[PDB]
Swiss-Prot record, chain B:
This is SEH-associated protein 4. Belongs to the WD repeat mio family. The gene is SEA4. It comes from the Eukaryota. The lineage of its organism: Eukaryota, Fungi, Dikarya, Ascomycota, Saccharomycotina. Component of the SEA complex composed of at least IML1/SEA1, RTC1/SEA2, MTC5/SEA3, NPR2, NPR3, SEA4, SEC13 and SEH1.
Curated annotation (Swiss-Prot), chain C:
The gene is MTC5. It comes from Saccharomyces cerevisiae (strain ATCC 204508 / S288c) (Baker's yeast). It is found in: Vacuole membrane. This is Maintenance of telomere capping protein 5. Belongs to the WD repeat WDR59 family. Component of the SEA complex which coats the vacuolar membrane and is involved in intracellular trafficking, autophagy, response to nitrogen starvation, and amino acid biogenesis. May be involved in telomere capping. It comes from the Eukaryota. Present with 556 molecules/cell in log phase SD medium. Component of the SEA complex composed of at least IML1/SEA1, RTC1/SEA2, MTC5/SEA3, NPR2, NPR3, SEA4, SEC13 and SEH1.
From Swiss-Prot, chain D:
It is found in: Vacuole membrane. Belongs to the WD repeat RTC1 family. This is Restriction of telomere capping protein 1. The gene is RTC1. It comes from Saccharomyces cerevisiae (strain ATCC 204508 / S288c) (Baker's yeast). Disruption phenotype: Leads to short telomeres. Component of the SEA complex composed of at least IML1/SEA1, RTC1/SEA2, MTC5/SEA3, NPR2, NPR3, SEA4, SEC13 and SEH1. Interacts with ribosomes. Present with 606 molecules/cell in log phase SD medium. Component of the SEA complex which coats the vacuolar membrane and is involved in intracellular trafficking, autophagy, response to nitrogen starvation, and amino acid biogenesis. May be involved in a process influencing telomere capping. WD repeats lie at residues 8-48.
Curated annotation (Swiss-Prot), chain E:
The basic repeat unit of a COPII coated vesicle is composed of 5 proteins: the small GTPase SAR1, the heterodimeric SEC23-SEC24 complex, and the heterotetrameric SEC13-SEC31 complex. This repeat unit polymerizes to induce membrane deformation into a transport vesicle. Component of the nuclear pore complex (NPC). NPC constitutes the exclusive means of nucleocytoplasmic transport. Belongs to the WD repeat SEC13 family. WD repeats lie at residues 6-45, 50-91, 96-133, 138-180, 187-229, 237-276. GO terms for biological process: COPII-coated vesicle budding; ERAD pathway; mRNA transport; nuclear pore localization; nucleocytoplasmic transport; positive regulation of DNA-templated transcription; positive regulation of ER to Golgi vesicle-mediated transport; positive regulation of protein exit from endoplasmic reticulum. This is Protein transport protein SEC13. GO terms for molecular function: structural molecule activity. The keyword Ubl conjugation does not apply. Present with 21400 molecules/cell in log phase SD medium. It is found in: Cytoplasmic vesicle, COPII-coated vesicle membrane; Endoplasmic reticulum membrane; Nucleus, Nuclear pore complex; Vacuole membrane. Keywords: Cytoplasmic vesicle, Endoplasmic reticulum, ER-Golgi transport, Membrane, mRNA transport, Nuclear pore complex, Nucleus, Protein transport, Repeat, Translocation, Transport, Vacuole, WD repeat. The gene is SEC13. Its main location: membrane. It is a peripheral membrane protein.
């Protein structure tokens, strides 16, 4: 009863309990990508890797770096802010290359339906120049 | 009425004569637009100021926000795009979208052109793929991450 | 006059994920495809309706039981129904429920024997679905 | 021979009813770990009923193997009430164990 | 989907894409025709002509690597095509073998953009087509087929079908940085026409070597390094010459290609006797 009170998992599964989950999940994810269901293979691989990290890279290699400038007042806070809603950006950003201005995901998907230029007004046609 | 004063003084002030009253009216109208949550109107006002700030030659005289962020590639530690599906300097492979396994491409905006690089977990998906994946989930799709991006 | 070159083939076949066998034949050339979905254990129709993460742990197996029942699958439907019955919880906490869940003779024995049975049927879809259901309900 | 089939069908039907009642009383005293046992037993009897109506190793969800495994888990756990109740209700139709062990369990209860 | 008179001469190989929406048919006419076979319509796209001889095998690359298609022909040069903006175009040429090249097959996407080249000079080559190939003497008198082992995990093995009455198994070795020989199987009295490795590995591994002497061996491997058990697909002899064997994507369903324009389906029982499943002809 104490040990049942001392855990939150429904089951105490181990590697020997499910011996070959990895190969079966991997092959069914490949068969899912053969079909037109690319979200479900991500779901099943996420379940597999969650358990794998529980009992124990091509998706990396690019990281964003903020431009370092010596600022003192409002502009140090406003250097890392969105250029459409004027709030801080910390998750799910959008970065242009010709001009180095951030945007939110929802802010970009709202602004580019009714926009042509950068919302900060630097004169960059970001739909054609983010490369 | 600061609205008409700003929207009229933007036609000639940064182009011809620097005066603080126009700057005060512009800042007041932009803060009022932010307070009204009229972000679309604020962005239209900013791009209209940048359109009407060009001189006869074409030099933009309005003050713009400085550049903020740029994208590295962790191998040669340089910018991957100059102001292909490979880094143009070290030749490394760009990370792919976790939904469709298509890499980044360097050299009206559609929702299937630009990556959405989250600045917390640094994992990039296309815009439409990321919207479709986060419309029914709240976890980053790459293995070994725990970050609710959207 | 020294090259080992075989006689060219006049026909062949190609397999797709939906079970259609793409065959090209000689006497002009004729390329045909015939439906052979009955000979394949893994079905794409079942994968579109499964929901193994966006519900309760009993909800996954009940939804899969209804899905397998609606496509005239019997043994898989009863397996999902039994696994639904073995994965029932409540708002109140009873430690004996966790004790019975963690026993080697319950739940885990069912997963092991279902894996052993479905290996001989070559049903990779059911193996991976059982693994992801029994690993998503781990929490 | 059809009369024996009809008798077996009625036996499965009122055994389903008895299993439902035993699950109802367990759910009444709010014990889920033994409520689930009788739900499994009822579903296995429903499986056997539909297989009789519609008419290598055994699957784990078979109506005999699941009942025998639940009985073995009960007699390893020590739940006397359930391991004797299964021996009353499912002995003649489904051979669980030896007759000597079953009669000894009834006598000990 | 009925496609009549796709080529003016004998057709040799028709391989579907990764999504089963495009069909690439190559023949002896030095022509490879691409069709959009989505739904029931099979409208042609291009009539690409780049080969100087008859074209033997084609294989679609993974869409993770883009829309790339491989093609080998009699001339000994491997031609690689990339479809950009709806325009099929040549990219790279691989011509190392002196004799004719018979079989070409892309590796699965976990291995990278590797292309497997097996020619009729008794040698095989492994190439990486990005943006130093490894040359291995596979067999003595000739090699007719070469196939990849599927990647079960996130150990690179490939099987070679030679004309030396042998089925050879090859495994990567990091000591010599070459694909070294791991096992040899003898089950045929003639040249092995085709070898196929099953894409799904459950319980035991699978293989399928068909040959022109009207016999077929379904080699199975239970353990990770155990001996490959040999069994016959059928007790009798095949009515005509066997050409190709193509495994099903799911399960173990084998489609054969006899010389009499007949495709025969084979499915395994619980015991292991390969009962025939169906027949496709004309
Ligand atoms: Zn914003
Ligand atoms: Zn900008
Ligand atoms: Zn820009
Ligand atoms: Zn670089
Ligand atoms: Zn993508
Ligand atoms: Zn992440
Ligand atoms: Zn994130």
């Amino acid at each position: 009863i104490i040990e049942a009170y001392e855990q939150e998992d429904l089951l105490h599964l181990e590697v020997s309990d499910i011996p070959k989950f990895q190969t079966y999940i991997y092959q069914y994810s490949k068969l899912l990508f053969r079909w037109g269901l690319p979200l479900e293979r991500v779901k099943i691989l996420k379940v597999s890797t969650d358990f794998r990290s529980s009992y124990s890279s091509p998706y990396n290699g690019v990281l964003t770096h903020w431009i370092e400038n010596n600022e003192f007042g409002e502009e140090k806070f406003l250097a890392r802010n969105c250029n459409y809603c004027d709030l801080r950006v910390t998750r799910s950003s959008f970065i242009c290359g010709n001009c180095q201005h951030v945007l939110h995901s929802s802010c970009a998907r709202i602004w580019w339906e009714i926009g042509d230029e950068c919302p900060s007004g630097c004169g960059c046609n970001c739909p054609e120049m983010f490369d | 009425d600061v609205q008409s004063a700003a929207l009229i003084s933007i036609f000639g002030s940064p182009r011809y004569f620097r005066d603080q009253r126009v700057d005060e009216w512009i800042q007041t109208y932009r803060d009022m637009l932010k307070s009204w949550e009229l972000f679309s109107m604020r962005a239209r006002f900013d791009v209209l100021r940048s359109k009407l700030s060009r001189t006869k030659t074409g030099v933009l005289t309005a003050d713009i926000k400085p550049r903020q962020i740029y994208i590295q590639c962790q191998n040669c530690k340089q910018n991957i795009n100059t102001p292909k599906y490979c880094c143009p300097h070290c030749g490394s492979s760009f990370p792919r979208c976790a939904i469709c396994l298509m890499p980044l491409g360097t050299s009206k905006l559609k929702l299937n052109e630009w990556f959405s690089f989250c600045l917390s977990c640094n994992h990039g998906m296309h815009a439409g793929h990321a919207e479709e994946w986060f419309d029914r989930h709240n976890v980053c799709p790459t293995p070994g991450c725990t970050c609710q991006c959207n | 006059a020294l090259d080992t070159t075989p006689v060219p083939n006049g026909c062949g076949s190609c397999w797709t994920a939906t079970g259609e066998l793409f065959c090209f034949f000689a006497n002009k050339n004729l390329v045909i495809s015939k439906n052979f979905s009955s000979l394949l254990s893994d079905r794409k129709e079942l994968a579109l309706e499964y929901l193994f993460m966006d519900a309760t742990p009993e909800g996954f197996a009940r939804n899969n039981a209804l899905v397998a029942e609606k496509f005239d699958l019997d043994e898989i439907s009863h397996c999902w129904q039994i696994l639904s019955d073995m994965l029932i919880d409540q708002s109140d906490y009873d430690p004996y429920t966790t004790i019975w869940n963690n026993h080697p003779m319950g739940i885990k024995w069912f997963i092991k024997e279902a894996i052993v049975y479905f290996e001989r049927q070559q049903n990779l879809q059911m193996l991976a679905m059982l693994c992801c259901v029994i690993l998503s309900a781990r929490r | 021979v059809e009369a024996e089939l009809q008798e077996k069908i009625q036996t499965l039907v009122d055994l389903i009813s008895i299993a439902t009642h035993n699950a109802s009383v367990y759910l009444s005293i709010d014990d889920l770990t033994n409520f689930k046992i009788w739900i499994l037993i009822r579903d296995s009897l429903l499986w056997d009923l539909k297989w009789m109506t519609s008419s290598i190793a055994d699957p784990p969800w078979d109506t005999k193997k699941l009942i025998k495994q639940l009985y073995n888990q009960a007699t390893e756990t020590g739940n006397v009430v359930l391991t004797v109740n299964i021996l009353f209700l499912f002995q003649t139709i489904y051979q669980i164990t030896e007759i000597d062990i079953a009669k000894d369990a009834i006598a000990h209860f | 989907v009925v496609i009549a008179n796709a080529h003016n001469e004998l057709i040799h190989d028709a391989v579907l894409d990764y999504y089963g929406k495009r069909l690439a048919t190559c023949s002896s006419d030095k022509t490879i025709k691409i069709f959009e076979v989505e739904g029931e319509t099979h409208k042609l796209i291009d009539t690409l002509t780049g080969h100087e001889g008859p074209v033997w095998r084609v294989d679609w690359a993974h869409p993770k690597f883009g829309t790339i298609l491989a093609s080998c022909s009699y001339d000994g040069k491997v031609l690689i095509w990339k479809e950009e903006n709806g325009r099929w175009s040549q990219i790279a040429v691989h011509a190392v073998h002196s004799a004719s090249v018979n079989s070409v097959q892309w590796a699965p996407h976990e291995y990278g953009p590797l292309l497997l080249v097996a020619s009729s000079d008794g040698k095989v080559s492994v190439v990486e087509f990005k943006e130093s190939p490894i040359i291995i003497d596979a067999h003595a008198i000739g090699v007719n087929s070469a196939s990849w082992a599927p990647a079960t995990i996130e150990s690179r093995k490939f099987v070679t079908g030679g004309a030396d009455n042998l089925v050879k198994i090859w495994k990567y070795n990091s000591d010599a940085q070459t694909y070294v020989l791991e096992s040899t199987l003898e089950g045929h009295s003639d040249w092995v026409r085709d070898v196929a490795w099953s894409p799904t590995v459950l319980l035991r591994s699978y293989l399928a070597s068909v040959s022109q002497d009207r016999t077929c061996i379904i080699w199975t491997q239970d353990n990770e390094q155990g001996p490959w058990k040999k069994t016959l697909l059928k007790e009798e002899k095949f009515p005509d010459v066997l050409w190709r064997a193509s495994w099903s994507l799911s399960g173990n369903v084998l489609a054969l290609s006899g010389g009499d324009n007949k495709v025969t389906l084979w499915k395994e029982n619980l015991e292991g006797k390969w009962e025939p499943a169906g027949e496709v002809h004309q």
